[PDB]
């Protein structure tokens, strides 16, 4: 019985800019329960149909999990284009695997702020599929030095999410995983 | 070739209200002599990164020009609200090119102060993108034909005194 429980029932999920990748092998897993589970809001994937997953013996399984806002969730799919997709997590067009997302707004919000899950904005020079690069530094066009923030001149690339308001269908703190075969 | 030196090295600059326009085309202009110069305090470009304009060809560009304060430069932007973004030359919310400015206190100085400069400060309503109004008349609720009679134009009281020094603004829009 392969242990997907801790992957799907962990405590502290990694930030989007530094998503944690887990290795799964030498185990037998059942996909009947995952598709039969209605507690997960979104379960749609291709490359292999979900109903036929009970008869496969592929080599390696990757468990990637991170946290994204309820908006731009569809940007996780490959061949897309967006603020987060093209910049912090890009999937190749030759991708095979599935994407799973569920709401977890029961233990993140309705408090004096969350301030846990950072991200970088529309900057840098785009992304390639599967890099996981963290080079936090201050840079901006305009023939500038590197001394500090100085907005009239430079910016600090990363800022925070906000899920304090109870409002927002696409603003609730959703959690997402992407299994790759 | 397009002679940018005519507008960037002219002798006199029109006031903000009656700003002299220009339209240049059918020539070759390089966007490096002005970009690399260190005399420009501010050089902000919208919709295009400055060093790739040479690889782009357009139908026609424009060269607006006027004179404003130093601390009043920032109203020249897509959609603020002040004394120039509502009552004088006002940018639209659409595409805009590269807005330039620099300090020009060298040739605008001395005890008298260049009172020839003037600006509009008594407009009765908002403007349209690139309005360029030309008129002069009082406004008041007195129903008096030919006059209480405050002039609708004031004079920039310039003098060699950090947000009041003369600046030169030239806008490239295409």
């Amino acid at each position, epitope marked *: 019985l392969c242990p997907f429980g801790e992957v799907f029932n962990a405590t502290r999920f990694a930030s989007v800019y530094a998503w944690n990748r887990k290795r799964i092998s030498n185990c037998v897993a059942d996909y009947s329960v995952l598709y039969n589970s209605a507690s997960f809001s979104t379960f749609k994937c291709y490359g292999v149909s979900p109903t036929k997953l009970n008869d496969l013996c592929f080599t390696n399984v990757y468990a990637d999990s991170f946290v994204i806002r309820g908006d731009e969730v569809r940007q996780i799919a490959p061949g897309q284009t967006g603020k987060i997709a093209d910049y912090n997590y890009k999937l190749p067009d030759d991708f095979t695997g599935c994407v799973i997302a569920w709401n977890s707004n029961n233990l993140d919000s309705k408090v004096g702020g969350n301030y846990n899950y950072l991200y970088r*904005l529309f900057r840098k020079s785009n992304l390639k599929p599967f890099e996981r690069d963290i080079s936090t530094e201050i840079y901006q066009a305009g023939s500038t030095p590197c001394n500090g923030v100085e907005g009239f001149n430079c910016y600090f690339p990363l800022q925070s999410y906000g899920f304090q308001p109870t409002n927002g269908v696409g603003y609730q703190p959703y959690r997402v995983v992407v299994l790759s075969f | 070739l397009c002679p940018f030196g005519e507008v960037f090295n002219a002798t006199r600059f029109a006031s903000v209200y009656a700003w002299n326009r220009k339209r240049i085309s059918n020539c070759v202009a390089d966007y490096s002599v002005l970009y690399n110069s260190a005399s420009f305090s501010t050089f*902000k470009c919208y919709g295009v990164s400055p060093t790739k304009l040479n690889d782009l060809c357009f139908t026609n560009v424009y060269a607006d020009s006027f004179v404003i304060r130093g601390d009043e430069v920032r109203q020249i932007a897509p959609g603020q609200t002040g004394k120039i973004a509502d009552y004088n030359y006002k940018l639209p919310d659409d595409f805009t090119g590269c807005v330039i400015a620099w300090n020009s206190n060298n040739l605008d100085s001395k005890v008298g102060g260049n009172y020839n400069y003037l600006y509009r400060l008594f407009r009765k309503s908002n403007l349209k993108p690139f309005e360029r109004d030309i008129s002069t008349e009082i*406004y008041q609720a007195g129903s008096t034909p030919c006059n209480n009679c405050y002039f609708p134009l004031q004079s920039y009281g310039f003098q060699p005194t950090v947000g009041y020094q003369p600046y030169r603004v030239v806008v490239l829009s295409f």
Partner: antibody
Amino acid sequence: QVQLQESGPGLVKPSETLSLTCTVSGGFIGPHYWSWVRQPPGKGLEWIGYIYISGSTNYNPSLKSRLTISVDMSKSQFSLTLSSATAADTAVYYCARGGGYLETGPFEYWGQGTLVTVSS
Amino acid sequence: DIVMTQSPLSLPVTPGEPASISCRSSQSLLQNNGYNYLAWYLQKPGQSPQLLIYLSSTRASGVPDRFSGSGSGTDFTLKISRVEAEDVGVYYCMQSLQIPGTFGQGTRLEIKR
């Protein structure tokens, strides 16, 4: 230097027009937006709206149905008229000089303050 | 509307050491310019509010040069290098990107003795 000052009645009956006047002294006519602001007792501050010298103005959407503001160049005074008020509007009113006109909002100068009460 | 938040709500500080007050926004505060608009007022007991910082990085006329701010986007921070006997009051932070402009709850600074 500019020294603002208010004046007006202190007690007003419910559902009755409220009138005040923030006289300006010293620095006369100029290209500066003027605003109004109030404060519920023991709470935060609430900005209302701003008026230009000519007369153009923008209003807070919450109070855009029963409030008016004008100006008078000759007397260097501008007034605030609020009608059909309730008891919730009992507060202290300050008149500013810079105006938070969605551009910079430099509140360079503030008034002394006047308290108004709604009761019968 | 966009709502301002501060942290903490009360702060006791002994004279001599630096302090800090944080005001976090709910929406990105950066107009089409490179500027980010913000303000920091100071209301002493029994008086009217005064201006200390505007544009989050430029002081006002006559203000002692001990106050300063930094940050961009949705995070800003004000610091007082050396507090004094006259720094008793309630501090507010204003956003002015678009109508309406609303303040925060108001940090209360406490002096120790």
